[PDB]
Design a protein around this ligand. Structure first.
Ligand code: Q9D
Length: 257
């Protein structure tokens, strides 16, 4: 395993799912029975969108969106009145990567905040985000399609599933991406839910650097079979994203880079 210093940290890239990343997600409409109100607040961007947007910022790509996307929220979503259709005019977008900053502390301009919020909202819509206080997407299978079909990334983009490879061949694919300066979209499931995040480095002893999409919290080095951030888990126990694992690899704009 080659040593690769965190690719996203080298470019200052640290996004989250709340403000000011979520200023253009749908505004919650209803109180879920038995829950406190989130009415009038923007929905979370979704960890799938935050992970994908961080990788897109690493490439500063695309300059122009390629294809619009439309979908309808599940009618069992309790936060919105139904039917609720969502639409992103991605084919008209000119993303200004000077305004989509690597991270946000609060002092940025409204133009800069709207720039990342627009990208976050477009990406979430393109993966059929089930918006709410928490926002869920199927992840990899939608991400790989969106990156190519809506955002014009190279045909090298594809999902790989952990169950299809030996441990060595799985890690060798991740290592190959990192050797080509290509952060990897990654997701998994376990006893603290399902989460999507970015693998962007390697320490030479079979640990990988992870950007969890929480603004920096819990980022660090993890084994791919012990993706267990301490920021999650109530009661003191163990838990991580070690089942049903998949990745999106080949993420680059061009045929060679
Ligand atoms: C990480 C995140 O925002 C989201 C959390 C979540 C929100 C709403 C519903 C669920 N749910 O499990 O029904 C979860 N998780 C997420 O989007 O996970 C993506 C994913 C990870 C692993 C496998 C499939 C999908």
């Amino acid at each position: 395993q080659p040593v690769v210093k965190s690719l996203l940290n080298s470019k200052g890239i640290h996004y989250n799912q709340g403000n000011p990343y979520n200023l253009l997600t749908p505004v919650i409409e209803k109180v879920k029975p038995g829950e406190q109100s989130f009415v009038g607040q923007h929905a979370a961007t979704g960890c799938v969108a935050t992970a994908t947007a961080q990788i897109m910022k690493y490439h500063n790509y695309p300059n122009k969106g390629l294809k619009d996307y439309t979908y309808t929220l599940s009618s069992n979503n309790p936060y919105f009145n139904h039917p609720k259709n969502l639409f992103a005019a991605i084919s008209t977008r000119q993303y200004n990567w000077n305004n989509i900053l690597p991270t946000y502390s609060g002092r940025e301009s409204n133009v800069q905040k709207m720039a990342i919020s627009e990208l976050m909202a477009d990406v979430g819509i393109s993966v059929d985000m089930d918006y709410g206080p928490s926002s869920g997407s199927a992840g990899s299978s939608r991400v790989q399609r969106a990156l190519k079909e809506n955002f014009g990334y190279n045909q090298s983009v594809h999902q790989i599933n952990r169950s299809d490879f030996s441990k060595q061949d799985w890690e060798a694919q991740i290592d190959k991406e990192l050797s080509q300066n290509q952060p990897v979209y990654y997701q998994g499931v376990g006893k603290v839910g399902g989460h999507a995040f970015v693998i962007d480095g390697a320490d030479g002893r079979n640990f990988y650097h992870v950007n969890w999409g929480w603004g920096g919290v819990s980022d660090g080095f993890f084994r791919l079979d012990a993706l267990n951030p301490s920021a999650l888990g109530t009661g003191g126990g163990a838990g991580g994203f070690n089942g049903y694992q998949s990745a999106v690899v080949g993420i680059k704009p061009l045929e060679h880079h």
